[PDB]
A and B are shown apart, each in its own frame.
Chain A
C-alpha cells in the first residue's frame, strides 16, 4: 500500500542521437533528433530549422536510422529501444494532419545474452536487404526486410568474437557484408563476413583480417564511388579496402579522443569529426582518376576547423550549416566557412539550444523572497559547466504604483499627432472617467475636451484623421488634433445607452442590446451606415482589420446572451454563417480575434473563467478546434500586446495568463502576478515599451519576459560544478567545482582556459599541512557566488589531489555562526579507494573566507547532512556523528560500520537516517541514550543506488543504476525482530532516466501531498508527489482505460515500458503513476475521451477538471 505520482516538469534536453534525410517528402531535408523518449522532426531551410513534429515514445531510443528500400517513395524510420522494442516508422500527412505510423514492430531481446561491451549497435545494409543488430556478446541478430516481416522476426547467428567494438555494412558489395573491430588478447583486429540469410550463417568476407590499434573505436563505411572502411583510434586514423591500406598519425588528434563523425559530401571526399574537447575536425579523402576506370584514392588528411560544444551527435545540413547535438552542454546550430576569422576558426555559431545538461546537483531558493521557488542546478561538465536558475512563469517589472480602487478599462493616448508615445491614459472607472496627462514619467490627473468626467467611458481607441474618440454610456463623442473640441457627437436616436463598444483606428461598431449599428469617423465627423437586430442580447463584439485590409475591417464575431452562444458574420450586411452553441448559464464576457504568422484566430472567454478556442479563415468562415481550458475562476478579458515579431494575446483573470505561439500553435503560460483586471500596450517618454495593468486597486507598467512555461537564466562557469549550497544569511551560494589542468615541463599544472575559479574576484589556496608522503589532473574549488549578480565573489582552491565531494551550510551546536562545510578526499589513480580525507569548516564574512577548523579522516567523505546541531557524515563505509565543541572543534560521538560504502544520507526531523552504494537503503536512529546509533532496518535487494530521499517517517524513495524508482516502508507486523529488521519494496517504477539528485521544494504557488524534485543526467526534471488511496485508485483505473484508447508508436505497451527492470529481475509497476500519461487525457478527442468512462459515481468532464487541478502541481 504505497501511493505515488510522478510527472515531468522539464522534458529531457540532452541530444542522444540525430540523423538526416528525406522523411517528410522526397524533396525535403529533415533533421531528426532523438532526446531520450522524445523524437524531434525538423525541416531544414535558409533560416535553419522549421519544426514539424515532436512525438514521444515508450522507451529510450537506442538506435535511430533512416532508410529506403525498393519502390518506396520516401524514407522510413528505424527505431530500436533500450528494452529491445523495435519498430519501423512512416511519415504521414493527411493534408492538414500529421501521423507517424507503425509499418512494423516487435521485441528483439533474447532470454540469453549478456548485454555487450559498447551497448546496442543497430546497422542497415546499403541495399536494404536487412537490419543487423548487436545486442549481445557472442551473438549477432538479423532482421530481413521484406514486404511482410511485419512483426520483425529475426534469427541470431554465432560470433566467434566475444568483444566487438563497432560494426557497419560495407558499400559496393556483392553479398551483405559487415566489418568490425573486435578485441582479444594480442590486441584489436578488423574482420569481415558476408551474410547469406538463405542459410543464416556468415560465410567469408573479402578481406583478410588485419590488425588495428589498441584504441581503435570507430568504423566508417565509405560510400560506393570509394568503397571501403575508415578506422579511428587515438592519435591515429586508417583506411582499409582490398589490399589497400592508408594511414596517418597527425599529432593534432592525439590530444583527445574522437567520438562522433558524419559524412559531408554524399561521395564522401569529406567527413566531420568530434572530439571530447569540443574540437571539430574535417577528414579529407584525396580521390584519383584513372581514365576508363572507377575512382581510387591517393591520400587522406585532417584539418582543424574550430570548436563546438562537446558533440555527441553531428549532422551536416544544407550549405555549411552543421547541427551539433550535445549532452555535456548546450546543442547548437553552426556555420562552416571557406575563410577563417580572427583566431582562425572556420566555425561560427548561428544558434544555441539550451540543454539542462547533466544536472549534477541542485536546490531550491526563492531568490526574490517570494513564495515561489526558483531552482538552481549544477549543469554540464568541463567547459560546458554552468549554473541554471529555473523559474516558472512569465514575470513583469513594476515601475509606478497608483492605488486606484475602480479602474474599469484603459486604452493608449498620444498627446500628439506624430510621436509613437502617449502621455495620457484614459481609464474607464466606477461609473466615471478620469484622465492622466503625464509630465512624462510623472503622474498627473487633469481635464480634456469633448471627453466626459462624470460619465463612464466604454472606450478610447485611436481613430485616424487627427481626432480622439470617447465612446461612453450615452454618446460616441469626437475631439480633434487641429480643433481639439466638440468636433462631432453621435447619439442613439431615442436616448438609449450603448451597451457594448468596439472599433480600431478607422472602424466603429456599437450595440444597444440585440441592436447593431455601424458608424465611421469620416473627416471630422461621425457618419452612420448599417443596421440589424439580433435573436438575443449582444454580450460582446470584436473588430480589428486583419491581414489584407487596412483600417476598413472584413467579417466578424459576436457573443449572445440567453442561448449562451457565439457566431460568425459580415460587415454592412450582417449575414450569419456557421456557429457554436456553447453550454451553461454563464455568458461569454469576451470574444476577440487575432493572428500571428500563418493563421487567423477566434477565441471566446466566459464568465466562469473557462475558455473555448478556435482558428479562422479571412475568406470563408468555418468552425475549428473545440476545447475548454480553465485559467481563472473569474471572467477573462482578452487583449493583445506589443512584444517582438509576433505581438501576442494576454488573458486578464484572477490567474493572469499569456497566450503566445508554439510550433505554429499558441502558448498558455502563467503570468507571475497578483491578479490583473485590464491591461494594454504603452510607450510614454518616461515609460517606454510598457504594458499598463490595473488590478483591484493600482496601476502598473513594465516589460515582459521570454515565455516558455519556464524561464531559464544562465551562468557559464567554464568548468564543471559539482555541489551546491544556499547560505541565506550571507546571501550567496557555495558551489564545489573542478577544473582540469595539464602537467608542464616544470611538471607542474597549468590550465587550458580561464575558468570561474581562476577569474574569481578574490582567492585562497588551502594551506593546511595534514599530509606528508600532458598528464591530466583535476583541481577543486569552493566558489562563493553572489545570489544577485551571480559573480564568483571568492574561490578557495584545495590541496593537490584533494577532491571536494560534499558540501553543507549549517550552524553547529551552541555556536551562532553559520558555516560552509566541505567533506573531501585524497585521490590517486593507483589506489582503489581513498583512505584519507578531511572535513573543513569554513566561514564567509564580509568578503573573507576563513578556514575555521579542520579534521582528518581515514577515507572519502561522500556525503554529509546536518543532523541536530551535530554533523553527520559518511566516511568510507563508516557513518560518524560529530559534535561541535565550545572550543570550536569537530569531535566524534559514535559510528555505524555496517556499510559496503555509504553514498547518500538524509535525515527525518527526528533521529532517523538512510543510505548505500550497492544495497538499497538502511534506516537508522540516534539514541539520546548512550549517544549511539541503533540500526532500525534495511532492504535486502541489490540496488546500486544513485539517489535517495525520505518522503516521510515511513516512506523512503530511491533511484538506481538502472533508471528505476522504488519505495520502501518498514513492515508493520508481528514477531517484531526479523519482520521488523526488514522493510519491503512497496513501490516500483521504471523512469527511463538516471537520477543524480532528489530534493524537497516546488516551483509553483504564492489533492496531493509533499513535493520532491529530481534532476537527471539528461536534463529532465521530474517531480514526485503522494496520493490518497482513493485518488491512487481512480488514477490507476484511468491509467488502464487510457491505454486502450491511445495508440503508442512502436505499438509499445505502456505497461511494458513502466516496468521495474534490471538485467536480473522484471516486475510490473506498483504504487507509481505518470501524470505524464494521466495528463495525456486532455489532448484526446472528446469521442475517444468519452470511452474512458463506461463507469460514488460516473461522469465525463469531471475528469477533465481533475487532470486540470493536477497539471498545476508544477
Chain B
C-alpha cells in the first residue's frame, strides 16, 4: 500500500 511502504521505509530497511 506504500503505506505498509511508508511505515517500512519508515522504520528502516
List chain A positions with a Cβ less than 8 A from chain B: 119, 327-328, 358, 360, 381, 803, 805, 825, 827-828, 831-834, 860, 901, 903, 917, 946, 961, 994, 996, 1017-1018
Please give, as numbers and ranges, the residues of chain B lying within 8 Å of A381 by CB-CB distance: 11
Cβ-neighbour of A328 out of B2, B3, B6, B11 (below 8 A): B11
Cross-chain contact A1017 with B12 (CB below 8 angstroms): yes
Q: What are 6 contact pairs spanning A and B, CB under 8 A? A: A328-B11, A358-B10, A833-B1, A833-B3, A903-B6, A994-B12
Instruction: With both chains docked as a complex, state the minimum distance between the C-beta of A27 and any C-beta of chain B, in angstroms.
Output: 37
- Known contacts A827-B3, A833-B2, A834-B3: A946-B11 contact under CB 8 Å: no
Given contacts A358-B10, A831-B1, could you give 14 more A-B pairs where the C-beta distance is less than 8 Å? A358-B12, A360-B10, A825-B3, A827-B1, A827-B3, A832-B1, A832-B2, A833-B2, A834-B3, A860-B3, A901-B2, A961-B9, A994-B12, A1017-B11
Provide the residues of chain B in CB contact with A358, threshold 8 Å: 10-12
State in angstroms the CA–CA spacing of A860 and B2 once bound together: 11
B10 CB contacts on chain A under 8 angstroms: 358, 360, 996, 1017
Question: Which residues of A lie under 8 Å from residue B13 when comparing CB positions?
Answer: 119
A327-B12 in contact (CB<8A): yes
Q: Which residues of B contact A901 (CB under 8 A)?
A: 2
Bound CA span A901–B2, Å? 10
A390 to chain B, nearest CB (A): 20
Instruction: State the CA gap A119–B12 with chains docked (Å).
Output: 13
Contacts of A805 in B (CB 8 A): 3
CA gap between A946 and B13 in the complex, in Å: 14
- Tell me, rounded to whole Å, the shortest Cβ–Cβ distance linking B2 to chain A: 7
Q: Please, how many angstroms separate the alpha-carbon atoms of A358 and B11 in the complex?
A: 6
Q: Which residues of B contact A903 (CB under 8 A)?
A: 6
A832 / chain B contacts, CB cutoff of 8 Å: 1-2
**How many residue pairs bridge A and B at CB < 8 Å?**
36
**Whole-angstrom distance from the CB of B11 to the nearest CB of chain A?**
5
Chain A residue at smallest Cβ distance from B12:
A1017
Residue of A with least CB distance to B6: A903
Q: How far is the CB of B4 from chain A (nearest CB, A)?
A: 8
Q: Chain B residues near A360 (CB, 8 Å)?
A: 10-11
Closest Cβ–Cβ distance, residue A231 to chain B (whole Å): 22
Min CB gap A1024→B, angstroms: 20
Nearest first, the 5 closest Cβ-Cβ pairs linking A and B are: A1017-B12, A358-B11, A381-B11, A358-B12, A833-B1
Residues from chain B with a CB closer than 8 A to the CB of A994 are 9, 12
Q: Bound state CA distance, A832 and B1, in angstroms?
A: 5
Q: Which residue of B lies closest to A831 (CB)?
A: B1
**A1057 to B13, alpha carbons, bound, how many Å?**
21
Q: Contacts of A1018 on B, CB cut-off 8 Å?
A: 12
Residues of A within 8 A of B1 (CB): 827-828, 831-834
A946 with B9: CB separation less than 8 A: yes
CB distance from B8 to the nearest CB of A (A): 10
Residues of B within 8 A of A327 (CB): 12
By a CB distance below 8 angstroms, the chain A residues around B6 are: 903
Q: Given the complex, which residues of A lie within 8 Å of B2, measured CB to CB? A: 832-833, 901, 917
Q: A920 to chain B: closest CB distance in Å?
A: 17
Whether B3 lies near A803 (C-beta < 8 A) is yes
CB distance from B13 to the nearest CB of A (A): 8
Residues of B within 8 A of A860 (CB): 3
Q: What is the bound-complex CA distance between A1098 and B6, given in angstroms? A: 51
Which residue in chain B gives the minimum CB-CB distance to A917?
Answer: B2
Residue of B nearest to A833 (CB): B1
Set of chain B residues within 8 Å of A328, measured between Cβ atoms: 11
A761-B6 Cα distance, complex, nearest whole Å: 31
Residues of A within 8 A of B3 (CB): 803, 805, 825, 827, 833-834, 860
- Which A residues are CB-close (under 8 A) to B12? 327, 358, 994, 1017-1018
Residue of B nearest to A778 (CB): B7
Give Cα distance in the complex from A833 to B9, angstroms: 16
CB distance from B3 to the nearest CB of A (A): 6
What residues on B are CB-neighbors of A803 within 8 Å? Answer: 3
B residues less than 8 Å from A834 (CB atoms):
1, 3
CA distance A493 to B1 in the complex (A): 92
On chain A, the residues within 8 Å of B11 by CB distance are 328, 358, 360, 381, 1017
Chain A nearest CB from B5 CB (Å) reads 10
A917 to B2 alpha-carbon distance, docked (Å):
10
Give CA–CA (A328, B13) in the complex, Å: 11
CA distance A1018 to B2 in the complex (A): 21
Residue of B with least CB distance to A805? B3
A118 nearest CB neighbor, chain B only: B13
Distance, CA A134 to CA B6, complexed state (A): 27
Which B residues are in CB contact (< 8 Å) with A917?
Answer: 2
In whole angstroms, how far apart are the Cα atoms of A1018 and B13 in the complex? 11
Alpha-carbon distance between A1087 and B10 when the two chains are bound, in angstroms: 45
* Whole-angstrom CA separation of A833 from B6 in the bound complex: 12
Q: In the docked arrangement, what's the CA distance between A328 and B9, Å? A: 13
Taking the closest CB of chain A, its distance from the CB of B1, in whole angstroms, is: 6
Min CB distance A776 to B, Å, is: 12
Task: Return A718 CB to nearest CB of chain B, in Å.
Answer: 16
List residues of chain B with CB within 8 A of the CB of A1017: 10-12
In angstroms, Cα B8 to Cα A911, docked, is: 33
Tell which of B2, B12, B13 has the most Cβ of chain A within 10 Å.
Answer: B12
Complex Cα–Cα for A64 and B9 (A)? 24
> A944 vs B3: C-alpha distance in the bound complex, in angstroms?
14
Distance A825 CA – B6 CA, assembled complex (angstroms)? 13
Cα distance, A643 to B11, chains bound together (Å):
39
CB distance from B12 to the nearest CB of A (A): 5
Q: How far is the CB of B9 from chain A (nearest CB, A)?
A: 7
Report A-chain residues with C-beta under 8 Å of the C-beta of B9. 946, 961, 994
Q: Which residues of B contact A828 (CB under 8 A)?
A: 1
Contacts of A119 in B (CB 8 A): 13
Q: Which residue of B lies closest to A825 (CB)?
A: B3
Give the one of B3, B6, B9, B13 with max A CB within 10 A: B3
Q: A503 to B7, alpha carbons, bound, how many Å?
A: 63
The chain B residue sitting closest to A1016, CB to CB, is B12
Task: For the complex, give the distance between the alpha carbons of A360 and B11 in Å.
Answer: 8
In the bound complex, what is the Cα–Cα distance between A946 and B11 (angstroms)? 12
The complex places the Cα of A133 from the Cα of B12 at a distance, in Å, of 23
Q: For the complex, what is the distance from the CA of A825 to the CA of B1, rounded to whole Å?
A: 11
Considering the chains assembled together, what is the distance between the CA atoms of A901 and B1 in angstroms?
12
* Least distance between B10 CB and chain A CB atoms (Å): 6
Chain B residue at minimum C-beta to C-beta distance from A360: B10
- B6 CB to closest chain A CB, in angstroms? 8
A770 smallest CB distance to B (angstroms): 19
**How far is it, in angstroms, between the C-alpha of A360 and the C-alpha of B6 when the chains are bound?**
11
A717 shortest CB reach to chain B, Å: 15
Report how far A828 CA is from B13 CA in the complex, Å: 22
Task: Report A43 CB to chain B, min CB distance, Å.
Answer: 30
A825 cross-chain contacts in B, Cβ below 8 A: 3
Instruction: Report A387 CB to chain B, min CB distance, Å.
Output: 16
Instruction: For the complex, give the distance between the alpha carbons of A831 and B10 in Å.
Output: 20
A315 to chain B, nearest CB (A): 20
Cα–Cα, bound, A825→B3 (Å): 10
Smallest distance from the beta carbon of B7 to chain A beta carbons, Å?
A: 8
Chain B residue nearest to A903 in the complex (CB)? B6
Closest to A380 in B: B11
Separation in Å of the A626 CB from the closest CB of chain B?
Answer: 44
Q: What CA separation (Å) do A721 and B5 show in the bound complex?
A: 17
Q: How far is the CA of A358 from the CA of B13 in the complex (A)?
A: 11
Give chain B residues whose Cβ lies under 8 Å from the Cβ of A833: 1-3
How many Å lie between the Cα of A930 and that of B12 in the bound state? 43
- CA separation between A990 and B7, bound complex, in Å? 23
